[PDB]
Each structure stands twice: as C-alpha cells, then as structure tokens.
Write a protein that binds this ligand. Sequence first.
Ligand SMILES: O=P(O)(O)OC[C@H]1O[C@](O)(COP(=O)(O)O)[C@@H](O)[C@@H]1O
Ligand SMILES: O=C([O-])C(=O)[O-]
Ligand SMILES: O=C([O-])C(=O)[O-]
Ligand SMILES: O=C([O-])C(=O)[O-]
Ligand SMILES: O=C([O-])C(=O)[O-]
Ligand SMILES: [Mg+2]
Ligand SMILES: [Mg+2]
Lengths: 500, 500, 501, 501
Amino acid sequence: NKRVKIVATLGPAVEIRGGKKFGEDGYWGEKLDVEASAKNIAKLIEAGANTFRFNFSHGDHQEQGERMATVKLAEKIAGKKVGFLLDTKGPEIRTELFEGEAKEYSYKTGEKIRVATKQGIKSTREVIALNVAGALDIYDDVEVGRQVLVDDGKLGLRVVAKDDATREFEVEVENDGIIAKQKGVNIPNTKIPFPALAERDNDDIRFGLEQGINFIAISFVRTAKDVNEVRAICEETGNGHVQLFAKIENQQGIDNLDEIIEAADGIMIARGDMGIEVPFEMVPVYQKMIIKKVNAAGKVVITATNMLETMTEKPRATRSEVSDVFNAVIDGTDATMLSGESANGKYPLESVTTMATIDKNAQALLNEYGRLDSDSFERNSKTEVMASAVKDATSSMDIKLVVTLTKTGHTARLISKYRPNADILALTFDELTERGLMLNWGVIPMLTDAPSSTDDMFEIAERKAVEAGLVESGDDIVIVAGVPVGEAVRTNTMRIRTVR
Amino acid sequence: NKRVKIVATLGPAVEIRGGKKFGEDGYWGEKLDVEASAKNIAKLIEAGANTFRFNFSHGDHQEQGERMATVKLAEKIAGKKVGFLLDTKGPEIRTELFEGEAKEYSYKTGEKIRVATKQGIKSTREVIALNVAGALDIYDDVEVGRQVLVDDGKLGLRVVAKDDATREFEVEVENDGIIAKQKGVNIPNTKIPFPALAERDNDDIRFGLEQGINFIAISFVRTAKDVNEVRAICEETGNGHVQLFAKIENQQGIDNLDEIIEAADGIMIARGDMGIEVPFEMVPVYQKMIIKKVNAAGKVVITATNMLETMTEKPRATRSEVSDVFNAVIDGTDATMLSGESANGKYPLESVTTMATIDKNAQALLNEYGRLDSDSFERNSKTEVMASAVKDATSSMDIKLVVTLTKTGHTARLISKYRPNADILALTFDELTERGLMLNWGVIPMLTDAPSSTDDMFEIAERKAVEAGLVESGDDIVIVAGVPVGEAVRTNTMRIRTVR
Amino acid sequence: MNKRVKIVATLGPAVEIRGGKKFGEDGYWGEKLDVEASAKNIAKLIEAGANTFRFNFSHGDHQEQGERMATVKLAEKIAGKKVGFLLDTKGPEIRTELFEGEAKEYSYKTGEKIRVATKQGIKSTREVIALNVAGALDIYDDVEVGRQVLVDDGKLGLRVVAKDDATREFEVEVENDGIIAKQKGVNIPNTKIPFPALAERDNDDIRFGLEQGINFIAISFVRTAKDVNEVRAICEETGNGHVQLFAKIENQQGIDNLDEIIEAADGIMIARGDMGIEVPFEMVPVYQKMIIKKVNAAGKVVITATNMLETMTEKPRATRSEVSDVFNAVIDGTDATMLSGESANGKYPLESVTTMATIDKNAQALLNEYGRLDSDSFERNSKTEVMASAVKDATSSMDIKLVVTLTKTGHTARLISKYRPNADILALTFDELTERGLMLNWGVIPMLTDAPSSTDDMFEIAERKAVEAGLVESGDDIVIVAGVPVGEAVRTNTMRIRTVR
Amino acid sequence: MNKRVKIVATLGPAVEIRGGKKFGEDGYWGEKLDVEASAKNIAKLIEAGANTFRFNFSHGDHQEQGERMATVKLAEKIAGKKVGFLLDTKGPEIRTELFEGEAKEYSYKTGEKIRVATKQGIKSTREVIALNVAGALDIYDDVEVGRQVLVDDGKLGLRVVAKDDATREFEVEVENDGIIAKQKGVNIPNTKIPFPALAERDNDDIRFGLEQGINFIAISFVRTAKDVNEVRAICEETGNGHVQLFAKIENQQGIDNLDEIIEAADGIMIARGDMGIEVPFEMVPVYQKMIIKKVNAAGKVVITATNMLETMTEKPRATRSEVSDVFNAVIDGTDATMLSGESANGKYPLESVTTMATIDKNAQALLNEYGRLDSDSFERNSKTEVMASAVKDATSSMDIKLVVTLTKTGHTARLISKYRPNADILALTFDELTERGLMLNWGVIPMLTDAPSSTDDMFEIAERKAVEAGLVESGDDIVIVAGVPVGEAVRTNTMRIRTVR
Ligand SMILES: O=P(O)(O)OC[C@H]1O[C@](O)(COP(=O)(O)O)[C@@H](O)[C@@H]1O
Ligand SMILES: O=C([O-])C(=O)[O-]
Ligand SMILES: O=C([O-])C(=O)[O-]
Ligand SMILES: O=C([O-])C(=O)[O-]
Ligand SMILES: O=C([O-])C(=O)[O-]
Ligand SMILES: [Mg+2]
Ligand SMILES: [Mg+2]
C-alpha cells in the first residue's frame, strides 16, 4: 500500500469535451462531457491520487465548480473518496493578452522590447502588459538592471531603462522563447507591497468553501498574517474543519517559516516560484529543512513542481525526475505533487502511476536511508506517548496494520508523524475528518458508525481491517482507542491482536 | 521505592535465645525465643530484605526448620511477605573438629604441619582433617605444590609432600590465622569428581521443599546436569513453581555458563569461592558479563559475598564496599546479597539499611551510567513486544508506576527485564507467584482476587495501586493485562491512566 | 570556496565554431572548424570548473574525435589549467545507423508503421531504420513479436508487431511522438543478444584514443570483470598502464556482477540513461546510492551521469527536479557529476557547467549535516590509509584550510579523498599523467612540482605551492603529509600541522 | 603487558627494618633504622609497580619523613628505576594527640564514658583524648551536645553527651567497639570550625618537603581554589614551580567548589576516607565517577584513594568488594590507584602493590568494552591537542605497540595520556623533574634521554630508546611525535608512523 500521498492537479488533460480529447479541433468550443471526464478522473484515483488540486490561477468560478462536480461523480465511479484542495492565485503577476491574432512571439538575445505597468490593457510584440494582483502599479517598485522572468523563468528580460512618459520598462531579451496569457512573471528582489489577502482570493476561497473543499493551499505565504486572514474566513463560514497549507515560495516565507508552520496545518514546498525568488541552488537545502520542521510539528508537508515534468510530453520520466520523487520520500515528505503533468499533458494517468511506483519503491528504503528521526521528538501529550509506543511495537515485531478509532483525526496525525513501519487505518465517524486525513503519510481513512458504549471497538477494528482487504488470518495488528467510549478523554489504550 | 532486591542470609545474629543476644554466655545452651527473634527478622523485612537465604552448610534440619518458622511469624509481624531461598552445601570441603578443648590454632609462615584425607576422623594442631562431600577420598586428586586454602583463602597451606602410609598431605603454612569447623576449604586446579548431585543435598532440598521455599541456590553448578537434577526433584514433589539459581563459583561453571543459564531460572554470582577457584582479578569481568547475559535471557541475577564485609564488626562499611554495592546496581544486578553481615555479625539490621540506602541511590543513576541496554534485545514474543512498549511509555513521559495483572508472573518478568523508569506493581492471584517474583528488579508483588469476566481490571489496577500507597491523584500509570479475562491468550493490552 | 565535487563535461559541436558559425546556424556543417575560436569556448568551460572532458566514440569518426582532443589541448594552454581526457567506448550496444542523403533525423507520430532492418553495413531511410549492432551480429532470431525497441535513452518506443522473414525486417508501430536520429542508443529489453567479449570497433577506438593521449576510459555496458580486464590488457600492452578504467553500469548483468566489476575497475560511471531502461526506472535511485557507497568504500572514483541538467540543453535555467538530482548526488557521496547533451549538443554549454558548479559547491557545504558516506565504518587496511584517517581526524578537530600531500603516484591523495576531509586536498605530484589522473577524485586539486631532493624541505615547498596557488594566506592552518625522508621512506609516513607565515 | 594505571603507595614503618627487626616484632621501636635493608624492601615495591611514594605528614616528624625520603632515593638506585615523591599535607583538620607514656593507642567498648579535651598543646590519656586542631583553634564553642566525634575514617564513633565549662572538655560515649590511636583523623560532621587559610604547620611541612625534593603535593581538605593557590605561591617562591598540586576533595565545600579547584590544581585525589564521613557515604561513588570524568576532560591527573585493598593490611588476599573497587576505578577512567595502610602499616606491603598491579593490568584490557571516559566528546583546544587526537585515531586504526613523544615539559605526553590511546606512551624527556613529574599520568612511561641537536634524527632516537627499553621488537609499528625541527618548532607539530627494523 502506498504511504506517500499524491496531490494531482486537474485540468483539461483528463476532460473529454463533446467527444473530443484535450488539444483537438474546436475542443475549447465543445462543452464538457461530465460522465466520460469523470471515468478518466476515476482512473487517476485508482492509480493512487489521494487529493485533487484545483488551481484558481486558471479558470473562472464556473470551470472550477464543474470540474469539482466531475470529481464528486469520479469518487462514485471509483468507489473511493479523495481530498479537494484549492490553490489560490495569490500576490502574483501574469501576461494578459496580445493585440490581433497573436498568442505568443519569437524573441532573440540582445533584442530590446517593452513591458507595461499600466493595468488592464493589451500586449503587443514590442509592449508586454503585466496583469498584476489587484491591479497594483509596480512601476515605482522595479529598478533598472532587475530581471523580469516569464513562464517560470523559461524567458528572461533585463530592465535596461524606464520610460516615465508611459510607465514602461525597456527590456533586452536574454534568451529565446514563449510569452503567454496568465503565464507567471517573477521579478525577484522586489518589495511590491501586495495585500495580506487580495479580494479575488477572498472571493475564490468563499466560492471553493461553498462547493465543499478540505484543503486550501495559500500561494506566496509571507507571514502568519496571510494564514490567519484565511483561517478567519474558514471559521466565519462554519468551515473550521478546512486545513491551510502555506505555500513557501519566497525569501520572506523562508524567513518567517517557524511562525507560518505554527499558524498553518501544513506547508506546500512550491519549488516553481521558490527557485526563481531565491537562489535555485538553495531550494534543496530549504526542502529538507522544511520537511524536517513540519514533521516535527505533527503537520503535513507536500513537495511540489517539476517532479515528473518531462511526462508532460513523454511516456517515461528522466532519470533526474525519478531521482527527485525518490529523494522527496527519503527526505520524509507526506505527499508528492503533479501540476502540468496531470492537469495539462498527454500522459496524466501514466504520470500518476509513475509517481505511485516511485513513491512505493522509496517507502521500502526509509528504514535504511530515511532522514526523519522520531527518537529525537519530545512526547508532549499522552496521545503522543501512545503514538511513540505504537512506533515501538511496529519496530519490535512485524505489524501488518495500525488501526486508530479517531473522532477528529488527532491520533492518526500523531501516529503518522512517528512514521511507523505499518499502514495506518484511521476509523473515523464523519466524511470531513475522513477526507481531511488523506494527505497524512501512511493514513488510510475509512468512514464507520460512531461506536456505542456497548460496542467492542477491537472487534470493529479487526472486522473493518478484514473488510477493506488490508489483513488476513494470522496477521498481527496494533489497535488504539479511547476506552471506554464517552468516558475516555483521549486515545488511552493499545491492543496487539492476531486477526481471527 | 527500592528496585534492587536484597537477599539477607539469616543466622544466630538476629535470634534471641532464652533472653540472650548472639555471642553471650551459654547462648548456644539456651533455646530459641521465637516471638522476639521474629520481631528482629520483621525489622530486616521493613528495612528492605525481600528474601531470606537459609544456608544448609551450617545447621541440622531442625535449626533450618525452626528459623524458617520464625520468618513465617516475622512476615505476620511486619505485614509483608518475603521469598524463602535455600542454599545447598554442594560439592565442597570443610574442617571437622579438633581433639581436646581446641576450637582453633595459631600458625606461622614456613611452619610444616599435616592435612588428612581419611574421612570421618578428628583434627589435631599438626593434623587438620578434611570433611569432604559424601566422604570422598581426595588423596589421589591433589599433587605436591598445590594450595589448600581455609576460611575463604584467609589461610593458605602449600602441599610440600604426600605420606602414602597415612594418606596425609605435608603442608607449610603460608601466612598467619584461623582453622575452624565447617570452614570452607578450596583446592583450586583440582579435578575431584564430586557427584552431579550428592545425597545430603537431595535430602536438604526435600526437607526445604516440605517446609515451603520459593528458591533454591545450587552451590558449585558445573553443568546444566547439576540444575536438571534439582529440577527433577522439584517437578516430582509437585513444587514445579520453585526457581533454581545456579551458583557459578568455578571455571567449569564459567565454561558452561550459556547452558547453565538456559536450564536455570537465574544465576547467583558466588564471588567468595569464584575468586579462589579462578584468578581473583577476573571476577569483575565475569560479574559484568554474567549480569548482561542473565538480563538478556529475562532471568534473575544476584550479586553475592563481601558486599558490606566490614559491617560484620563495624557500624559503617568501607569505601570499597559502598563502591562494590553501587557498581553491582550499575552493572544491572536484580539483587544484592548479605551473608555473614546479616547472619553472623553485630549489625545485621544496619547492614540491610546500609545496602538499601546504597541500592536506592545507585538506581537514580542507571539512566546516566547503567550498563544494560534493552534497545539491543530481540523482542521474541507478543508479551515481550508489550514489555518494550511499556519501557517506551516510561521513557516518553513521567510514569509513577507500571501495573501488570499476571497469572504466572511472565509479564512482570519481561517488564523487569526491560528495566523501565518506574516501579512494577505485579497483581497476581496466588502466594506462590507473589513470593516467586520477589527477586525481580523493580517488581512489587501483591496478592489480589483472580478477576471475573465482568470486572474492570484497569479500575482494580488503580485501586490496588492507591491502597498500597504507590500513587495519588494526578499520577500517570501504565497498566497491562490480558483482555478480556478468559478469552485473552496473553498480556495484549496497555492503558495509560491518570489516577482519579 | 573551491569546488570539491568534480565535473565531467561531454564535448561535441555545441562549443565548436565552424567558419565563424555557432552551433545550429545555417551551413554550420558546410564550414571548416575554427580551432582557435573553438579552443577559446572550451577554455571557458575549464574556467567554469569542468575537470575532465568526455569524448563519446558512439558519435562521429576518429578524425572528429582527434581534432576535438587537439582543440582541448589548445584550450588548456589558453586557460592555463589542465583537465582530464576521458574516452567513452561504444560497448556491446545497438545504435541507429546513419541515414541516406545524410539526413540527421526524422520525427514520427504515435501509430505510424515503419520497419527496423537487421542487415548490417547499410544506412537507414525514414521508413527502414538500420542498426549498427556491436560485433555486426544478426539480431533477427533474437527479437520476438511484442518486444519494445527503444531509441535514445527510451525517448521513443517502437512496438514489434510483425517480422518479415523475406527481408529479416521488424515491422514496428511508433508508441509515442518523437525523433529517430543517427547514432542513437537502441535498447530491446528482455532479449539476450550474444555480444562479443570485446568488439573490434572498441579495440580500434581505445587504441586510437590511447595514441591521442587519454587519462580515463569509461567502458560502456560492463557485464562482468572480463569486460574491464580486456580493456586493461590493451592499456598495459601499449605502455598506457596509467590510464584509469571506469566501468559503466547500465544493465542487470552489470548490477549482478557489481562487486567483481568494482574490484577490477578504477571507478564506476552510473550510466543512468541505459540503466533506467534495462532495469526498473524506480530501482535506479536505489542502485545509485548503493554504488556510490561501495565505490567510495573501495577507495575508487564514482561519476553520476545523465539527465542531471537535461532542460538546460534548450533553456538557460534547470527544472527543480534537475537541481535536486545534482544536489542529492553530491549528498549521496559522488566524486563527480556529468553533463552529456547539456555540454555536447545544447544552446547553453558554458551556463550548464556554471550551474552544475554552483549546485555542487552549495551541496558540499551540507555534507556535514546530510552526507550519506561514513568513513568511521571503514577498515584502515594499510599504513597510508591509517594516515588518511588521521588527516580526517585533524580536519575534524580544528579549522584546517587545506591538506597537502606530496604524492608520487597519487595513492595518498586517493586515500585522503576517500575519507572526505573537511578541507581541499592539494596533491603535489611530479608528472602530468599522475596530475591529470587525479582530476576526478573528490576534493583533489592536482598540481605539478619538481620531485624534491633528499636535502629539500618538503613542508616549506608544500606551504609555498599552497600560497602561490592562492589557496591559503598567513595565519591559515594546513595539514601536510609526505614520505620522509625522500629515498628512504617506503610510503607516506609523516603528518605535519603547520601555520602559514 | 605494561601497567598503564599508576600506583601511589604510602610508605611507613611496614617496609622499614630496625636493627634487623621487621614491623611489629618486639623492641622494633627500640632499634635504629637499617637504611640499606629498608631501601631494599622499598626497591621491591618499585619493581612490583609503585610509580610514586606518598609521605603523609599527618604521621611522624620532619626527621622520620626526611630519613624515609632518603631511604627511597637509595631504593631507586638499587631498583635502577625512578619513582615520584608525593607529600600529603595535614590541612585544616583535627587529629588525636600523642598519648602520655608514649602509648600508641587504647581499645574502648560500646557505652564506655570518656572525655575529649579542647585545650591545645597537651597529650591524651586513655580517659581524656586531646586534639591537635589545625591553627591551634579552641573548638569548645563550635561543638554542641548531640554531635558525633568520629576517629580514623569513621571507624570509631563518640557521642557528645555533655560539656564541662570548667575544663572545656566534651563528655562522650563510645558508640561502637574500637581503637583511639595517636595522630588519627577526627571528623565532627555538621560543625563549622573556622580553620585558617593556610596553617603555619602546613607552611613548614611543605617548605621542609620542597627542601628534600618532591614532585607532587596532595593538599588535604581543599575547600576552595585559594587553598590550592596558597600552596602554589610557596612552590613558585622557592623555585619549585615544577611541583604538581593534587587537591584532596574530602568535604562538602570541596565538592561545592570542584570546578574552580580543578582549574587551580594539576589534579585531584579522591580522598574517599574523609569524603565518606563528611558527605553521605552512598554519594561517594557518584562524586568519584563525576570527578574522574571532569579531571580527565581538563587534561589533569586523578588518583582514587583509600580502602582499595583494606583487608590486605592483615591478610594476604583482598575481599571480592576490594578487587571490584580497584577494577571499577580503572573502568571509571582513574589515572592512578592508591595504597594507604596496606603499604604503610600492614603485614603485606609488597603483596598489596603486586595485587593492585595485577587488578589494574587486567582492568586496562577491558577499557575498550566498558571504559566510561569518552575522548570523542572533547574540544581539541590547541594544536598539540589536535595531534593528541590524531595519535588516538592512529592507535584505533591499526595495532600500535607504542606511542613515543619527545617532550621538553611533558605537555604532549599529558595531552596524549588524556585521550587514553590503545598503546603505552614512551615519554622521552631531557630532565629528571619532567621525568618524575609524568609518573602518575595514565599510560606514560617516562624516560630520560639527551636533548636532541638540530642535526639529530629524533625518529631514529625514538625507535632506539624504545628497543633498548625492551618495549618493541622488529616488525612492531609505533607512532612518534616531536616538534620538528628542534629550535624552529613552537610545539609538537609532527607525527610519524614507523615500523621497528
Ligand atoms: O507472549 P508469550 O511470551 O508467548 O507468552 C504467552 C504465555 O504467557 C502467559 O500469557 C502468562 O503471562 P502472565 O503469567 O503474565 O499472565 C501464558 O498464558 C501464555 O501462554
Ligand atoms: O506555485 C506553485 O505551485 C509553484 O511555484 O511550485
Ligand atoms: O557460596 C557462596 O555464597 C560464595 O562463595 O560467595
Ligand atoms: O551511457 C550513459 O552515460 C548512460 O546511459 O547514462
Ligand atoms: O585523606 C585521605 O586520603 C582520605 O581521607 O581518603
Ligand atoms: Mg549508456
Ligand atoms: Mg583524608
């Protein structure tokens, strides 16, 4: 069973529209064929995607809502639930549209063209327009000799001058390639004072909150305030169950990492922007340190971006991509992510299968090479003392499965944190807790009836483990619970049981 | 609470006879005053003696039986039970009696006198007679240039010749001192073929077995056969509950240590004879190795002899004696022993108090200096997996007490083996199991009613812990049990509970 | 900060100026090689931290290889820095043939139906791809219907759907969009092609490279120790016993025989391209970490190769997965990282070396916190190795700027580099072959000096050479090792802790 | 097998022949000292492995101490082996006075009622025990009814049951059977007697010992660093700056001030006799293990003292608890073990040294499995210490028979001994004071050689001296350290691994 969780970004790549697969003739012209689209998504779920990411940097509310509805059907086709993660636009910058029939342009090194700060206009081959977050004027934030990078740094522009008359940057193209709509723009070493939380994000979140989501990934978290602002909307709408993963993708994020970890439910290591906003060679340092610190706090860490990039276009990943996924698992990540690979490319299913195969192989080598060390943790509560004793039992003998009966998931989270040498079946009593545990390392969430004071929870643990196919006659399992139901304050009991 | 157990050898020193304390006028003339004697022994028990040793090398069956009866009353005065250990005479050699009014003689270096092998005779100042085990003739086992040592090596005799006409050794006294009745005699490097089990021992054991004992310490164990021979008598008389501690006190013992450990319930490190029979400087090597190997086998190790020797005559031990007791605890001994100190000297109570004080102080330093390492053990059974998880819980947080509900003591023994940072209250259901656990490190045995299938054993654990004074409101305890009673095959459950 | 992790850069047309024309400008191939301008490009890769150039004999002919090696010799004079020369053999491999009309390549679409010829000694057309099989073997009876023929490190899959006995051709379906170029690696998993012990082509390539002057041979598709021994025999026979053999592990037989291969070789190149097609792709990170640990424990060189900065063939910045792979290869314990297409065939060869150098330099500073190699586990099996252990201890006890070894053959420098001290290793040696021969050992800065006389102060020399190299300044503490005295010492026998004046 | 753990033996009458009479034969005291025959006895204790003799100034007068030191100087010439000379001061202590009629002692029974005088300058009778109080202090107002007066390391307890203001005498009850002898330690726990900073008696004893020629002073009852500094000032003032100070820790103030005492001293003597009465007896093993670890971490000497083989005062074999205590002191990390009554006052002084030597030699072979000291934890705070660490590493990497240090002051030998290498340390030094001054450092075999000239081969000398000492034979590997070259080197800067010819 795959212990490392997969976040798969959804998009047009899986969506059959009017009988036409993605990238064909008048595709964006046809309307979405829900049942067929849903069968594709079901196939991602069966292949090991544990959560779908809906990126609010691409698509009106209508595209998102319909995609979100397609997954709901997909869960019913697959007969398996997934988490629903919403990724915010956040304080970012993109490339608007081009005048005439143009979608892009060919540029050459030493070529001198223009970038506009004038918000809400159009792009010309000699005048690229910047769509900024909340239409801010960045003209007085950017100095000559700064770099404007387009399509995740795929194309660089050197600010060689500034025209006060038009509020335009004069830029010399540094290398050859593509300029595109809603295509990221980084201007590193730039103190643009974006809001603690833009309105468009406020709006996107409430929309997502009303559709039903489990997780919010908050782009460009700079300070705890950015997390707390989103917490506020979550508690206010009565969605206090929603978990916030701070996306660390700049120096301010890294500088305030400790305070961001405390306010958040987890960290998405957003290496795309991080490797432009900070020295690319420091990203692997920050990755390892962030995984260690988030695991130490009992929270969720997702490693993101370029993990199987090549499988956008090809059926097999490069040796560096297989290495990167493998090493994320060894570093101790709870989850690995696909973006364009699953959302936008020709092999989304294959991307998920491939990531699953790598993650499953790497998990077999965590004993030998794993970087996380649970022996170093302070056990700060009686539930955590029990998670430690569970890890000990799984080290002392061959344990097929750990079962926790968990009201809110707290026990499953502390067991996960300790990385036992076993899968963790988390028996919970509502769908929100079940979906909320789907990014925790090793945790297999399962809905069951809330136990009565006359029920045998150890018999329920065994029978639900047998039903789910996770154990058979003669297997040894560790079950934890709060006994007796409705007298116990917390998980207080551990039972070693041989399956009948 | 004292975790290191004390074996106190009983003898005349505590026994008021006819109103006369030990060593006074016509003392051995008066007859034993049981109730007063029993009040003295009760005082040893309250001071921390956990088991009384009855040494069958001194005293007819009548002396032993009456002493054993005095302890039974002592337990009732003290309101605390102790174990009853019988120490066999074994394949040894002693010094008979002297012709005329003599009890001893003064000798000088270079002096040439005689030793007799002729069994069952009398001693003269020029002719010391050897009382041998089962009256064997050792004349053809001992070569010229061998050493005959008397009173635990306190006095040495060099065999300078052999007189065939009388079967006597001609010996030159090596140093000045005491020759005495039933006073040990070692002849190291001597292959005397004593029986696998002498008749006198066979008889002593059956006598002890009929009085009611928990433990047999078998002097001069050479091979597993010596243990198995005693096992046979124990099973045959329906006393299969009795535990056998092999006394390792010669090279053959050390050579077959692994096979002796397997057949035995434990090892008494009998340093008195061991330090004459093997190089004295090797005894501390063998002590540490034997403690490690016996702990690894889940069995009991007692360290014996000269531990507080000086307190035979003085109210305060030497700095080397305090060091020796302290270091036995750090090495990982389950128990420390007094012989002459409690049996024969002027300060038996003070000897017990002193050993208790040292043992209690040393226990506080086992985390820092302790030699035993439970992390290195293979967990070879599900009860042992649980003993490991208990040790983990006691390492992760402050645990006042571990409670085991144990039918035969097996769970208490495996918890003890792991040396948790807590006292171990062992709730058992018969006196034989209760007394049988009294030499296991950290174990506080307590008799209670066998639980019914409708009882709450976690409530019974808490209430018996509160009754015994070991815990109060707010303390955290770890309780293990086989649940449910009469369905569980073994200890299968661990509960962390805060006392009400 | 000196870069301790070594870089192998593959050379090809990408650095080469032809008639004033840069790589992939029109008529480029029309023009003659501008040697001086090409040597000037190559000098920049030496300055950016390429320690050894790779000459892949799977591509081009003797004339192109020989001219390229001569251009590098000029580049060393322009840079004032020497580099190693590494020859990469074809091995028991399959490559695509040249095409008729010297077309370089063709694009194919999923579902396209084409043929693969088995007849040796012919050229490909777009519709009939011909194979150069090592030993000129006929593979027709070795490949069944249903086998996959993969082209260029598995970039393009071809499914065998039928066999024509008349022409001994395979009828194949293109499984994915991509390119068949000339001289591209061809894999056919789960076949047993009886390749010869040593191909005649390999015998000739190695002998031609030995003639030009090389320091290293990377032997492709090492299956057993006999593949290493066959090349060793040629190096010894031609009086090139100083040439080091790196076995390329890139199939299951190589993995199966790793122990005897490491014993017979001077090092291992982890050839991940072929390895990740010949074995399960997800096993390659397991084999990588394990090979680095075993080769370092044997006191030998390990090179991690292929796809390390792949995206930089076309773009000026690498992907996050690529920077991760380079950084993790350093943490794993690699002596060296390698560039293939990035430096041979790409738009950014200089920037590829500069980027790798930057990642390698950053990763070395985290070896204390994260490094996998554990020198405390090693048996010190000789007195030089005991001294290597003591040097490591001295660099752990205090801030040592530099270790200096006066080394005749490089043995002391290899044993110090094995222990991965927390310092640069200045290897003072007395001949250029030993000097170039150390350029892929972790942390080693090889430098030529005069063999010291029995009346020289080797400790004074060590300090002066270090100061002249700009490695140390007054107040720096250095550790120096030497066999003292010269002419009496059997080995490195002396360690001196010295403060620079 | 060389004994690495050092032995201090206290000398007294037990080795001394008087008019052909051995110790405790009649009229023994009647006769004059047979110097040659006494020196011959003492030579046997040197041969059995006593590295330093202790001269306890609490017992006897200057004349007896001076004669005894002269007898030892003769013993060294007879044995052909040098030993250290250690003076033990009285300190701020109480001792029983001499008795009238020069009776040596009296026996008392539990319940016997006697008196203790506070008036200074008088002799004891059996019924009125007089005290020699350091500083000739009047202690009458310092001791309340209910205090315990303990005699001879707590062997005999006296309960104070009343006070007679007329005579300023204590009325006391004997609590247990035993002996009050002349010049015996007296403890009175939970009193605060204002002893002087340095007693005039101590000033005179130290100055008399410095005149005879000593290497070490063990300062009794060190309370603070000022007690060490007061003695240091006298050693420096008299031109005896080479004399080493071992602070005796034997009360709670000493334990409280341990850090500043270790800083000020050259070493610690763990004086367990007084310590185990002035603090809870059951704390002494805790303080012992902790003092050994702190003194070894400071690069200094620790001596474990008192009751180590107590039973061998009267008997030829020690108890099992006594052999355990010696063995465990070695495992704890002690540089040295000590004999008091066993060697000074007993029937078996030679056998006591032989027995300790045997236990010490056996225990050193188990330091690898059980040793408490951990040199991996230490900061290497100087370049000599870095070299000491590297020597240890070399003795862990391979079988080293011997470490040889050419040491002017012994500093390199102390730093090597601190790291407890798995080898004997041959310290080649150029003066007898340095030589005797190293005789209590763990593992150090001090040996006098000629200061080497700037043209000598110090590595050839090291090997020859080692071979002449019979420590090594051809084929043995040795590690040698030196400051090279002589006259230029600021410190030990060179390590050589060398195979004996
Ligand atoms: O778990 P293990 O070591 O196999 O032991 C199982 C045995 O121990 C017992 O559980 C006894 O344990 P207790 O005496 O502590 O109750 C037996 O019933 C059982 O057969
Ligand atoms: O935002 C992201 O997902 C990134 O930059 O990786
Ligand atoms: O037999 C004993 O008890 C001994 O020798 O210690
Ligand atoms: O040959 C190579 O370098 C490979 O396959 O990676
Ligand atoms: O003074 C001493 O040596 C002691 O008290 O142990
Ligand atoms: Mg290859
Ligand atoms: Mg003292």
